Amino acid sequence: LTPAQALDKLDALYEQSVVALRNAIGNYITSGELPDENARKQGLFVYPSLTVTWDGSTTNPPKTRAFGRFTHAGSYTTTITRPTLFRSYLNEQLTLLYQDYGAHISVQPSQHEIPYPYVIDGSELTLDRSMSAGLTRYFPTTELAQFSPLSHFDARRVDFSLARLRHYTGTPVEHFQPFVLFTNYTRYVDEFVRWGCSQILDPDSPYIALSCAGGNWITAETEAPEEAISDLAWKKHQMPAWHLITADGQGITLVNIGVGPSNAKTICDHLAVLRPDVWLMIGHCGGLRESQAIGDYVLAHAYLRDDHVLDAVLPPDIPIPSIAEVQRALYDATKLVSGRPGEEVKQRLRTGTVVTTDDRNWELRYSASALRFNLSRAVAIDMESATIAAQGYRFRVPYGTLLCVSDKPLHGEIKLPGQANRFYEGAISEHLQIGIRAIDLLRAEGDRLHSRKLRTFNEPPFR
Amino acid sequence: LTPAQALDKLDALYEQSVVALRNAIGNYITSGELPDENARKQGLFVYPSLTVTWDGSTTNPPKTRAFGRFTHAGSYTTTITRPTLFRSYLNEQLTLLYQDYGAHISVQPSQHEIPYPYVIDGSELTLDRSMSAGLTRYFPTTELAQFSPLSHFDARRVDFSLARLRHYTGTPVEHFQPFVLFTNYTRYVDEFVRWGCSQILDPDSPYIALSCAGGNWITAETEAPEEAISDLAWKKHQMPAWHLITADGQGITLVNIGVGPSNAKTICDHLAVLRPDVWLMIGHCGGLRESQAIGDYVLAHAYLRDDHVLDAVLPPDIPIPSIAEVQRALYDATKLVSGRPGEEVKQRLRTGTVVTTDDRNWELRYSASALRFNLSRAVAIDMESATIAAQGYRFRVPYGTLLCVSDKPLHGEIKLPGQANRFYEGAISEHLQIGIRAIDLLRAEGDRLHSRKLRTFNEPPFR
Amino acid sequence: LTPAQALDKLDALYEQSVVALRNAIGNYITSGELPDENARKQGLFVYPSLTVTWDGSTTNPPKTRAFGRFTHAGSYTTTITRPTLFRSYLNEQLTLLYQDYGAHISVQPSQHEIPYPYVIDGSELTLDRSMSAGLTRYFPTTELAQFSPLSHFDARRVDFSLARLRHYTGTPVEHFQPFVLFTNYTRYVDEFVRWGCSQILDPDSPYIALSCAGGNWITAETEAPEEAISDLAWKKHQMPAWHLITADGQGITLVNIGVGPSNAKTICDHLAVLRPDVWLMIGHCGGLRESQAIGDYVLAHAYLRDDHVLDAVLPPDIPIPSIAEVQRALYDATKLVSGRPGEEVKQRLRTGTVVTTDDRNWELRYSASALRFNLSRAVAIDMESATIAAQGYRFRVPYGTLLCVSDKPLHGEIKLPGQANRFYEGAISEHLQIGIRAIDLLRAEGDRLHSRKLRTFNEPPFR
Secondary structure, three states, rough: OHHHHHHHHHHHHHHHHHHHHHEEEEEEEEHOOOOOOOHOOOOOOOOEOOOOOOOOOOOOOOOOOOOOOOOOOOEEEEEEOOOOOHHHHHHHHHHHHHHOOOEEEEEEEEEEOOOHHHHOOOOOOOOHHHHHHHHHHOOOOOOOOOOEOOOOHHHHHHHHHHHHHHHHHHOEEEEHEEEEEEEHHHHHHHHHHHHHHHHHOOOOOOOEEEEEOOOOEEEEEOOOOOOOOOOOOOOOOOOOEEEEEEOOOOOOOEOOOOOOOHHHHHHHHHHHHHHHOEEEEOEEEEEEEOOOOOEEEEEEEEEEEEOOOOOOOOOOOOOOOOOEEEEHHHHHHHHHHOOOOHHHHHHOOEEEEEEEEEEOOOHHHHHHHHHHHHHEEEEEEOOOOHHHHHHHHHOOOOOOEEEEEEEHHHHHHHOOOOOHHHHHHHOHHHHHHHHHHHHHHHHHHHHHHOOOHHHOOOOOOOO | OOHHHHHHHHHHHHHHHHHHHHHHHHHHHHOOOOEEEHHHOOOOOOOEEEEEEEEEEEEEEOOOEEEEOOOEEEEEEEEEEOOOOHHHHHHHHHHHHHHHHHEEEEEEEEEEOOOOOHHHOOOOOOOOOOHHHHHHHHHHOOOOOOOEOOOOHHHHHHHHHHHHHHHOOOHHHHHOOOEEEEEOHHHHHHHHHHHHHHHHHOOOOEEEEEEEOOOOEEEEEOOOOOOOOHHHHHHHHOOOOEEEEEEOOEEEEEEOOOOOHHHHHHHHHHHHHHOOOOEEEOOOOEEEEOOOOOOEEEEEEEEEEEOOOOOOOOHHHHHOOHHHHHHHHHHHHHHHHHHHOOOOOHHEEEEEEEEEOOOOOOOHHHHHHHHHHHHHHHHEOOHHHHHHHHHHHOOOEEEEEEEEEEEEHHOOOOOOOOOOOOOOOOOOHHHHHHHHHHHHHHHOOOHHHHOOOOOOOOOOOOO | OOOOHHHHHHHHHHHHHHHHHHHHHHHHHHHOOOOOHHHHHOOEEEEEEEEEEEOOOOOOOOOOOOOOOOOOEEEEEEEEOOOOHHHHHHHHHHHHHHHHHOOOEEEEEEEEOOOHHOOOOOOOOOOOOOHHHHHHHEEEEEEEEHHHHHHHOOOOHHHHHHHHHHHHHHHHHHHHHHEEEEEEHHHHHHHHHHHHHHHOOOOOOOEEEEEEEEEEOOOOOOOOOOOOOOOOOOHHHHOEEEEEEOOOOOOEEEOOOOOHHHHHHHHHHHHHHHOOOOEEEOEEEEEOOOOOOOEEEEEEEEEEEEEOOOOOOOOOOOOOOOOOOHHHHHHHHHHOOOOOOOOOOOOOOOEEEEEEEOOOOHHHHHHHHHHHHOOEEEEEOOOOOHHHHHHHHHHOOOOOEEEEEEEEEOEOOOOOOEOOHHHHHHHHHHHHHHHHHHHHHHHHHHHOOOOOHHHHOOOOOOO
């Protein structure tokens, strides 16, 4: 079976099942009819299954490629969902294994049923208690409990996160671009939207659309480009997102994750299933060194993890490295945008260890932290960095952090983003531009972007 | 010196210093003039100091009162800030020690200077780098490096939190009421404002005003009571607050803390300095038992602390108890507001252990958590409870938690806040009313509210 | 006082004290005469003391330099030993502070006496028990329990390590060069000596001498350059060293630390006092990825610390970053020497996380380690790397690791250093050359080499 063939059969089996599940739900609601356990056993409400097999012998198998590689010979399978949505990705991946390895591709019904909530296209159902109780009782519901994996996530895990992304983001998952930017300050999105609307108008710019948290779709032929940032978004969605789309889907997605490790973890948990090409943390931080000035930039080369939120799945003694590719991009982008070539940057940019804490009022316990700050040669403190970085590491998503000093806790200039602090607010536009330029630089690097620094021993074939 | 005298002298010394500091700042800005180190040594920019002394001999000293008591004989002192703001509190406290113990009160300049940022009534003065550098260099600044304590917080710690409360809350600290309600869902404030505006209109209701996050002040003689909830509030402030004020300052303050342990901890750190009479957690949770129905209520009698955020200052093995007074109020209010002719609360209310986690996607690791959930006899899971409760314990603020099941993760009904949930949205109004009634019941209890369950061995004299 | 003046006075006071101490010892040995407690109180047997003071005001103080900087105004002092030995270093350092800050330099007797064992130049005066007991009783001994630090180490700590370096190394501390190479396989020194002797003969090469472990001094005018590697060295010294010296003392020192974290830690502890410019780990490792071929190179970008030896002074959760400057040099040198121009290095060079263990037979417990190897995305495993890197971090000595796969434990190719390993043995010469070329590249970078990534908050003025 070939890539295009597999994709078509996945589409077929998927659509068929969701349509079948919808009907059953409809019938149960209109009359009280239940599906026959026999047809289900046949794969009535089942996700398609993709299996790739490799004999284990090829002339010269790619030994340098970061993804689309095989560690050993055997069969790799995985349940698939939303084939159309992942068309490109699945094509690209299956193609790599088909050609470079001459792998056997096969598609068939899985043993896993699609939880009914994921097939209800419109809105969540709102039947009376007796009705809901019946649905959860006779239909496929989510099951919290959960020879080789072909990809990082299975169908259920992906459907789970797609629903969440939409809810938290107030945006359709189809609009998400491969290059992500995370911010922890509302003004960054103000600046992003402005620069975005502007780009849409320039006929030379690839940016043709702007998806907005809340539903707004802005294009070059839109009447009132002011509805871009509807204040209602921040009340409806916890982590508002904005997508600057391009025809080839190589735009920039910006998510305002807010503040705290909890949110940073959560958003990455879901965004990971879209297999982004990279996500950068572009936000404010507290400068810990006497020589830093508000408005300066910090490029993180390591993290002191005091965020706790990931300690169970990724112990604090596991090193989270930097991605050279991303570091260079971040560094060069700072030279370019900040208008200071060579090593003039040194006066505006500091590269060092960032401390991420889950305690916003960490200042009330400075003495208790001082030793570790010193021990780690801390240069700045924030609340999302390490988390974003750890998640990128966990999910194989290139990551990086370029923060901007919004204050100096240890040197009297204590403040809080969202108050009277002109030197930081004046840095915002520039800061955002550095992130955007880094993305441009990385987007150009093509495949060089992804390296082997994130691969595990049992790394799945799909990127 | 008597209470009223002490209060007047504190007011005098305080205003004098803040005025002196403003002048010095103005002079330095207009000309470049610096204050003379001699006048400062005299207490030019200094916080007033309040000292209460007790000989150690009185007929029958209160041995049962939770607060306003002396452990031993001696002198107790503390720097004071915003005497006017704390007029009632300070009066009530000094009065108890003055009469019941015949204590000696004295007010004098302290050795601590008021950090200039706290005297700048308006926003920050827009100064260039050279100017700011000078201010932080020649004037008092907030420093992290920080006979017996008279109160829980000193002037600097208090000023620090007052500025914060205003920023996070979008409200003036003068409007905060003694009875606090914390919510984690935007709809609760919608319901609170509605019920509030309504009360303001009822001539029999003590509620005469409604302070709104953002600046709005609604009274019985206000034209458009719709500006109560300005959507812009949720963009400008992280933890919007609303105060239903009464003439005697015994109203109800509601803060939407949002989601996560980080925020819960932060807000409590600052709100603690206003010495609230009680704070209740009124939010949604996930029901963990199959016999629970969406919309049911959970009264927490214990907490499994998986929030991490407070592990350093309060180890997980330190037991956080329940306050019987608050429990009864919460239980009775559930009977009253929810009460139905032919039924017992047991069918709607479950009393048990709540798990508070910093991991929103804890479901992705159920197996790893299952043992502890069982071990703890967990009944519900949320993200703020334990934190609010632990902070209450730490700051001696009676606390309680009454949650409402918004979904059942372990039983095929995963629903998210804001998603279409017929039976949880329908419970919000009643839920809020239970909180409000519990407050009413506690407000009536007068002093019974506060007990000795929160006192430490070195408990300060002031409540 | 000027740098040159300070150096002369340090030399004077130092020589004077060591001479005074020798006499006193001589007198006690020949007759039984004890020094008078009065002359001692005057600084008879005392180390010189160097003090630098800074008013705290300078036009534009260096805010970018990695070393020779002041954090605040005040006085910095330290006891000094072997001024002649450290002449260059002390000169360079005092000069930076003298000119760039116009600092006040002063030299005077300290309150610390030189332990007599450090003044016994030969150490060959055998004394009976009664005599030794007397010496330790009436003279300055090495006390184990040993206004702001001017440098990282004090006179006693330095003397302590200089003695050790000589003993372990079988070399005079005066011969140590600023650029260090650490190896864990004897063949690397064979290759180093060969390439060294050869360089000494080329009239264009800066290398004019070769100090050998054991005592040999080889020059362009030496008869038998075969005595370079005397087999007796490996029996006499635990960590033999070899120095390729140049007229300006910018050669290359190579130390064969052997195997194990204990040795790696120990050698660094002592070598640190000579304030090297950099030290690189050039040794073999086990390749953990099936795509790696024996002979391939591993550039470490992070370390999984399973060495234990440094856990107490540097907790495993403290991140040990990579030094970009060193990483580039190592990377570039691999391109140049490995003659694989461009991105083709990828096939020979793998950049990733290295696991350092103190358990050579770790293979007997693979299952127990597999989880962490995977968790850390381990690429190779060795026994010195992390330790060397940690020590570099702790002592502010730029560091880096470029290992060469000598075997593949996880893939049926286990090989022991010294066994017939066609593809590892054939790469040793190339490997060593990569290290040497990295040093050449770094040596050219001048001051760029040192960055601020290693500075602590209380970082001493001296490099």
